[PDB]
Amino acid sequence: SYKSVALVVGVTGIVGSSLAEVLKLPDTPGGPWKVYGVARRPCPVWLAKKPVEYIQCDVSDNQETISKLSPLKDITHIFYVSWIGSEDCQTNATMFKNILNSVIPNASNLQHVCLQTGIKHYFGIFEVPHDSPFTEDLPRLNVPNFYHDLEDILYEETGKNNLTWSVHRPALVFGFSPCSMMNIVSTLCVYATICKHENKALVYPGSKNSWNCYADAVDADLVAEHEIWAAVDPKAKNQVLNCNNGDVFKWKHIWKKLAEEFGIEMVGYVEGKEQVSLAELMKDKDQVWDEIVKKNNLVPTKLKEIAAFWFADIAFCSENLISSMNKSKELGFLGFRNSMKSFVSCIDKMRDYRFIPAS
Amino acid sequence: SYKSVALVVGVTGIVGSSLAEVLKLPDTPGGPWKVYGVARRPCPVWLAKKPVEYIQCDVSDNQETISKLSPLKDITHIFYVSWIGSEDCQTNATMFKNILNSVIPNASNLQHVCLQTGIKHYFGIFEVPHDSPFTEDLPRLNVPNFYHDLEDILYEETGKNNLTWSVHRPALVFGFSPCSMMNIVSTLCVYATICKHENKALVYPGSKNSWNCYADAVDADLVAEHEIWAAVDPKAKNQVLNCNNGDVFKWKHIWKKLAEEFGIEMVGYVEGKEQVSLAELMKDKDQVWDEIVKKNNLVPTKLKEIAAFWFADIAFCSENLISSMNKSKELGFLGFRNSMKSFVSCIDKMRDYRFIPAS
Ligand SMILES: NC(=O)C1=CN([C@@H]2O[C@H](COP(=O)(O)OP(=O)(O)OC[C@H]3O[C@@H](n4cnc5c(N)ncnc54)[C@H](OP(=O)(O)O)[C@@H]3O)[C@@H](O)[C@H]2O)C=CC1
Ligand SMILES: NC(=O)C1=CN([C@@H]2O[C@H](COP(=O)(O)OP(=O)(O)OC[C@H]3O[C@@H](n4cnc5c(N)ncnc54)[C@H](OP(=O)(O)O)[C@@H]3O)[C@@H](O)[C@H]2O)C=CC1
């Protein structure tokens, strides 16, 4: 007997994996929560030791989704925290439609759908941005951003079925999942771990501007708390909401912290030196990674899975992307984190869980 | 019969005038509060209609301070929210010493001294800065900053007399006092009011960087709340604490808002155009101001009193001065304001109080 029943679509992801932890805490709003977690891969080892009912399901395949999710009649809240690995508006849209079409007719006590998008809503796509600080009310850019498609489906389907909705636009996520397609902290920890292995310094590859500019981020657990808040507090219902840690930082200070955490020398940004691609620097390091994995008895991960060096490249030529938390705060959500501390905490947790070497 | 008795040194100032309002609210921590307000000028009209016992006193004159403050035996908390009008370490230090030397021996139930300094602690003096975001633990710069003198006296005097202390470092203050030596909002409202009068556009005089960079500020009432918090909550005692609104903004967006609030056309920053001095643009506008005052039946103010065009000049060549609120938040203070809204609210309040024209 449970109070609430969550479907977490993307349970292996950087946010879904936090939700799987946060939803099972005793103090969590709306608890006690039962948790169904969906992902495409077979349940990895680390997740089998969690109290989540894992449903292995390719949610881009409609018949499969119907057969796997239509029996789930007790669901009360959906948390869509997934995307396919690309910016295809059509294929991302299919996943979300298949979730709703499979669950809405079958779960008579469904109440709410949380959709997670992101701050790209304000400045465009990875394939003429608004100025910042970004606020929720800013109109859509004239670009094929799959976030637009997902919102439209969200509004259409919740409205005709008398369900409430929320849209969450997190900033860059600080999290611990080694299964994510965009995990900045594990990406940078892997780079550091490789530098250390090869007796090299932690050399910063990015732009001058990304070194020196203000940046913001969100801890995965805070995103989970923010999503859980919008799912249970009537004041938050049917709102588009940004989600960040509530402060700002600079990569320059994070880089120092990173070097210290791995006990290696740092080479910061060098005046006049231009961005180099971390993707290229790490192009054929997969066997090095495989060695470090076996050597340290880590959870086995492939280099391309734990790390997204392409994504660090983007973070390191980005600037002026700060988002505002005023709306959420004026609605009464006062969750926050110290971003420097959240970063270190992600490092610790990935060591703790044995995704990366201790010490 | 009162619970707490506040001495507000600088009661006509941009923060002291907020404290005079905030301390008299029924829900205010530590209330009901009795309020003594000190300033050098005779009580201006607007302040005579407030329930504060006004003590006219030149606090740089020791005998005068002794005779005026030594009878005040019931004081429990001092809020030092004043400075002389300059950066002289010696003359600022005299004021603060004279307050403590006159009150500490005479008020046996004295508990706490709040000292207000500022973010200049981190980057130097108006007459080689730390990088930001500024955190409280950053060491002193090797400069003659009178803030250093005030802290040293604060620590010395509170320690030997078994009193608790706090140091508050607000960001740029958004407030309503027409008696302040550094009131950015009234300064900009005056400029706007003059543009409107002379049928000119609201032309931005500042630098490119100050137009485009992230900036932060603090609402006066929030500073008062922050100071009151540190004065009554044991968790906050004997701490140095930054104070800002909890978000960031850009002058570019504020400028638009300012133009709208005065119904005049805006001319924003123009690429390649260099900073001009607002002090010089307004050099002999005092009779214009005098006219606008009589014409609109405003509280009578001299141009040099309501406005500090020199100070807007500094704000408009400044950048990279963001301060962190993480410490305060981790101690449990979750007060905040929307800076865009706080700015507008200062405008409204100055109209409300008749310091500047309505509409
Ligand atoms: N820093 C970040 O990571 C940020 C992300 N966002 C946004 O948040 C949203 C969710 O992304 P994020 O949390 O990063 O996701 P992750 O890449 O960490 O996780 C993706 C999840 O979706 C699952 N998934 C992918 N394709 C399928 C499929 N066909 N069927 C079933 N499950 C699938 C994955 O499991 P499996 O591996 O088995 O396929 C995985 O569990 C995206 O819109 C993203 O842009 C926004 C801001 C920041
Ligand atoms: N934006 C801002 O204004 C910021 C200010 N700060 C800092 O806060 C501190 C306090 O300043 P702020 O609140 O701006 O002050 P204001 O200039 O608004 O107020 C000064 C107050 O002190 C009184 N005062 C000045 N000299 C004397 C004297 N000899 N005897 C008695 N009273 C006196 C003034 O009254 P009277 O007019 O009668 O002399 C007035 O009430 C300063 O260190 C300042 O740097 C920090 C960050 C931002």
Contact A322 B248 (CB under 8 A): yes
Task: Specify the DSSP element, H or E, that contains A243.
Answer: strand A239-243
C-alpha distances in Å from residue B56, one per residue of B41, B53, B65, B67, B115: 6, 10, 10, 12, 20
Please state, in angstroms and rounded to a whole number, the distance separating the CA atoms of residues A136 and A138: 6
Nearest to A315 by CA among A226, A211, A168: A211
**Mind giving me the DSSP string for B218-235?**
EEHHHHHHHHHHHHH-GG
Nearest to B252 by CA among A133, A82, A351, A346: A133
State the CB neighbour count (10 A cutoff) for residue A235.
Answer: 10
Nearest to B299 by CA among B356, B345, B346: B356
Place of tokens 């008579």: A108
SS3 (DSSP) at A57: coil
Among B324, B341, B344, B345, pick the best mutation site for testing chain A contact (most A Cβ within 10 A).
B324
Task: Specify the DSSP element, H or E, that contains A31.
Answer: none
Specify whether the CB–CB gap between A181 and A309 falls below 8 A: no
C-alpha distances in Å from residue B209, one per residue of A247, B54, B81, B156, B313: 21, 42, 30, 41, 13
Specify whether the CB–CB gap between B339 and B174 falls below 8 A: yes
Please state, in angstroms and rounded to a whole number, the distance separating the CA atoms of residues B77 and B271: 51
Residues of A in contact with B334 (CB under 8 A): 334
Specify whether the CB–CB gap between A52 and A69 falls below 8 A: no
Mutate to test the pocket of ligand 1, among A12, A47, A79, A83 (most ligand atoms within 8 A of CB): A83
Q: Which of A80, A147, A191, A269 is catalytic?
A: A147
Mutate to test the pocket of ligand 2, among B14, B36, B58, B184 (most ligand atoms within 8 A of CB): B14
Please state, in angstroms and rounded to a whole number, the distance separating the CA atoms of residues B77 and B224: 13
Please state, in angstroms and rounded to a whole number, the distance separating the CA atoms of residues B167 and B239: 6
- Phi first, then psi, for residue B262 (nearest 5°) are -105, 5
Cβ neighbours for B290, distance < 8 A, ≥ 6 positions apart: B302, B303
Contact A329 B322 (CB under 8 A): no
Contact B326 A334 (CB under 8 A): no
Q: Given phi > 0 = left and psi -120 to 50 = alpha, else beta, which region is B320?
A: left
Please state, in angstroms and rounded to a whole number, the distance separating the CA atoms of residues A115 and B162: 55
Q: What is the DSSP secondary structure assignment for residue B97, as one 8-state letter?
A: H
Please state, in angstroms and rounded to a whole number, the distance separating the CA atoms of residues A261 and A268: 15
Ligand-binding site membership of B328 (annotated):
no
Within chain B, residue ranges assigned H as helices are 16-22, 45-48, 62-69, 89-103, 120-123, 146-160, 184-197, 208-212, 220-232, 251-262, 278-281, 286-295, 303-306, 309-315, 326-330, 339-352
Active-site annotation of B, residues = 120, 147
How far is the alpha carbon of A180 from chain B, nearest alpha carbon, in Å?
29
What would the two tokens of residue B114 be? 């709040």
- Phi first, then psi, for residue A337 (nearest 5°) are -145, 150
Specify whether the CB–CB gap between B27 and B99 falls below 8 A: no
Q: What is the DSSP secondary structure assignment for residue B76, as one 8-state letter?
A: -
How far is the alpha carbon of B227 from chain A, nearest alpha carbon, in Å?
20
The residues with which B77 forms a beta bridge, in sequence order, are B6, B112
Residues of B in contact with A247 (CB under 8 A): 133, 324-326
Place of tokens 């498609």: A149
Give me the sign of the Cα torsion angle A7, A10, A11, A14. negative
| HEC secondary structure over B146-199 | HHHHHHHHHHHHHHHCCCEEEEEEECEEECCCCCCCCCHHHHHHHHHHHHHHCC
Count Cα atoms within 13 angstroms, Cβ side, for B5: 14
Contact B252 A131 (CB under 8 A): yes
Please state, in angstroms and rounded to a whole number, the distance separating the CA atoms of residues B123 and A45: 51
Cβ neighbours for A7, distance < 8 A, ≥ 6 positions apart: A36, A38, A69, A72, A75, A77, A78, A79, A99, A103
Q: Given phi > 0 = left and psi -120 to 50 = alpha, else beta, which region is A52?
A: beta
How far is the alpha carbon of A338 from chain B, nearest alpha carbon, in Å?
6
Which residues between 325 and 344 in chain B have a beta carbon less than 8 angstroms from any beta carbon of chain A? 325-326, 329-330, 334, 336, 338
Please state, in angstroms and rounded to a whole number, the distance separating the CA atoms of residues A175 and A158: 29
Please state, in angstroms and rounded to a whole number, the distance separating the CA atoms of residues B207 and A300: 53
Chain centre to alpha carbon of residue B21: 14
Count Cα atoms within 13 angstroms, Cβ side, for B133: 28
Contact A248 B338 (CB under 8 A): no
Cβ neighbours for A256, distance < 8 A, ≥ 6 positions apart: A266, A268
The residues with which A77 forms a beta bridge, in sequence order, are A6, A112
Count Cα atoms within 13 angstroms, Cβ side, for A265: 5
**Ligand 1 atom with the shortest distance to the CA of A181:** 17
How far is the alpha carbon of A339 from chain B, nearest alpha carbon, in Å?
9
Contact B329 A336 (CB under 8 A): yes
Atom 25 (ligand 2) nearest CA: B84
Please state, in angstroms and rounded to a whole number, the distance separating the CA atoms of residues A3 and A8: 16
SS3 (DSSP) at A72: coil
For A167, counting Cβ atoms within 10 Å of its Cβ (0-12 exposed, 13-18 middle, 19+ buried), the class is: buried
What would the two tokens of residue A23 be? 């939803």
How far does the centroid of ligand 1 lie from the alpha carbon of residue A358, in Å? Answer: 27
Count of domains observed in chain B: 1
Preceding peptide of B139 cis, ω within 30°: no
What would the two tokens of residue A265 be? 């020398």
Please state, in angstroms and rounded to a whole number, the distance separating the CA atoms of residues B319 and A212: 12
Nearest to A218 by CA among A241, A190, A252, A239: A241
**Ligand 1 atom with the shortest distance to the CA of A40:** 38
State the CB neighbour count (10 A cutoff) for residue B37.
Answer: 26
Domain span holding position B39: 1-359
Nearest to B19 by CA among B312, B307, B230: B230
Please state, in angstroms and rounded to a whole number, the distance separating the CA atoms of residues A170 and A217: 8
Specify whether the CB–CB gap between B356 and B190 falls below 8 A: yes
What would the two tokens of residue B55 be? 């003590």
Contact A131 B247 (CB under 8 A): no
CA trace torsion B109, B112, B117, B121 (10° rounding): 140
Long-range CB pairs of B160-164 (<8 Å, 24+ gap) are B161/B104, B161/B110, B163/B104, B163/B110, B163/B111, B163/B112, B163/B113, B164/B111, B164/B112, B164/B113, B164/B237, B164/B238
Closest residue in B to A324 (Cα–Cα):
B247
State the CB neighbour count (10 A cutoff) for residue A295.
Answer: 10
How far does the centroid of ligand 1 lie from the alpha carbon of residue B327, in Å? Answer: 33
Please state, in angstroms and rounded to a whole number, the distance separating the CA atoms of residues B340 and B338: 6
Preceding peptide of B234 cis, ω within 30°: no
The resolution, in Å, is 2.0
**Ligand 2 atom with the shortest distance to the CA of B177:** 18
At position A274, the amino acid (one-letter code) is: E
Please state, in angstroms and rounded to a whole number, the distance separating the CA atoms of residues B348 and B350: 6
Specify whether the CB–CB gap between B311 and B304 falls below 8 A: no
Nearest to A16 by CA among A125, A2, A40: A40
Residues in chain A: 359
**Mind giving me the DSSP string for A191-212?**
HHHHHHHTT--EE--S-HHHHH
Task: Specify the DSSP element, H or E, that contains A244.
Answer: none
Q: Helices B251-262 and B184-197, interaxial angle, to 10°?
A: 50
Contact A247 B325 (CB under 8 A): yes
Identify which ligand lies nearest to the alpha carbon of B217.
2
How far is the alpha carbon of A249 from chain B, nearest alpha carbon, in Å?
7
Q: What is the DSSP secondary structure assignment for residue B355, as one 8-state letter?
A: S
- Phi first, then psi, for residue B34 (nearest 5°) are -90, 140
Specify whether the CB–CB gap between A22 and A228 falls below 8 A: yes
State the CB neighbour count (10 A cutoff) for residue A189.
Answer: 24
Mutate to test the pocket of ligand 2, among B15, B82, B304 (most ligand atoms within 8 A of CB): B82
C-alpha distances in Å from residue A7, one per residue of A34, B79, B199: 9, 53, 61
Nearest to A326 among B253, B326, B338 (CB): B338
- PDB experimental method: X-ray
Residues of A in contact with B330 (CB under 8 A): 338
Ligand-binding site membership of B318 (annotated):
yes
- CATH code at position B157: 3.40.50.720
Please state, in angstroms and rounded to a whole number, the distance separating the CA atoms of residues A179 and A301: 8
Residue list, ligand 2 pocket, CB within 6 Å:
B 10-16, 38-41, 57-60, 81-84, 95, 116-118, 170, 172-173, 177, 179-182
Please state, in angstroms and rounded to a whole number, the distance separating the CA atoms of residues B123 and B171: 12
Identify which ligand lies nearest to the alpha carbon of B61.
2
Q: Classify strands A112-116 and A77-80 as parallel, antiparallel or unpaired.
A: parallel
For B46, counting Cβ atoms within 10 Å of its Cβ (0-12 exposed, 13-18 middle, 19+ buried), the class is: middle
Please state, in angstroms and rounded to a whole number, the distance separating the CA atoms of residues B185 and B173: 8
Ligand-binding site membership of B173 (annotated):
yes
C-alpha distances in Å from residue B150, one per residue of A82, B52, B75, B83, B114: 54, 26, 20, 10, 11
What would the two tokens of residue B182 be? 């550094």
Our answer to whether residue A97 is catalytic in this structure is no
Chain centre to alpha carbon of residue B193: 22
Nearest to B101 by CA among B127, B74, B78, B128: B78
Residues of B in contact with A334 (CB under 8 A): 334
How far does the centroid of ligand 1 lie from the alpha carbon of residue A81, in Å? Answer: 6
Residues of B in contact with A251 (CB under 8 A): none
Please state, in angstroms and rounded to a whole number, the distance separating the CA atoms of residues A16 and A22: 10
**Ligand 2 atom with the shortest distance to the CA of B39:** 32
Which residues between 207 and 266 in chain B have a beta carbon less than 8 angstroms from any beta carbon of chain A? 214, 246-250, 252-253
| HEC secondary structure over A128-196 | CCCCCCECCCCCCCCCCCHHHHHHHHHHHHHHHCCCEEEEEEECEEECCCCCCCCCHHHHHHHHHHHHH
Please state, in angstroms and rounded to a whole number, the distance separating the CA atoms of residues A26 and A31: 7
Q: What is the DSSP secondary structure assignment for residue B349, as one 8-state letter?
A: H
Preceding peptide of A133 cis, ω within 30°: yes
Please state, in angstroms and rounded to a whole number, the distance separating the CA atoms of residues A233 and A167: 14
State the CB neighbour count (10 A cutoff) for residue A11.
Answer: 29
Q: What is the DSSP secondary structure assignment for residue A54, as one 8-state letter?
A: E
State the CB neighbour count (10 A cutoff) for residue B130.
Answer: 16
Q: Classify strands B33-39 and B53-56 as parallel, antiparallel or unpaired.
A: parallel
Residue A99 CB less than 6 A away from ligand 1: no
Contact B247 A133 (CB under 8 A): yes
CA trace torsion A220, A223, A224, A227 (10° rounding): -160
How far is the alpha carbon of B247 from chain A, nearest alpha carbon, in Å?
7
Chain centre to alpha carbon of residue A63: 27
Q: What is the DSSP secondary structure assignment for residue A323, as one 8-state letter?
A: B
What would the two tokens of residue A327 be? 């709306």
Residues in chain B: 359
Preceding peptide of B133 cis, ω within 30°: yes
Specify whether the CB–CB gap between B173 and B342 falls below 8 A: no
Place of tokens 């947790």: A349
Q: Helices B339-352 and B184-197, interaxial angle, to 10°?
A: 60
Please state, in angstroms and rounded to a whole number, the distance separating the CA atoms of residues B349 and B359: 12
Within chain A, residue ranges assigned H as helices are 16-22, 45-48, 62-69, 89-103, 120-123, 146-160, 184-197, 208-212, 220-232, 251-262, 278-281, 286-295, 303-306, 309-315, 326-330, 339-352
**Residue A137 touches chain B, beta carbons under 8 Å:** no
Contact B322 A214 (CB under 8 A): yes
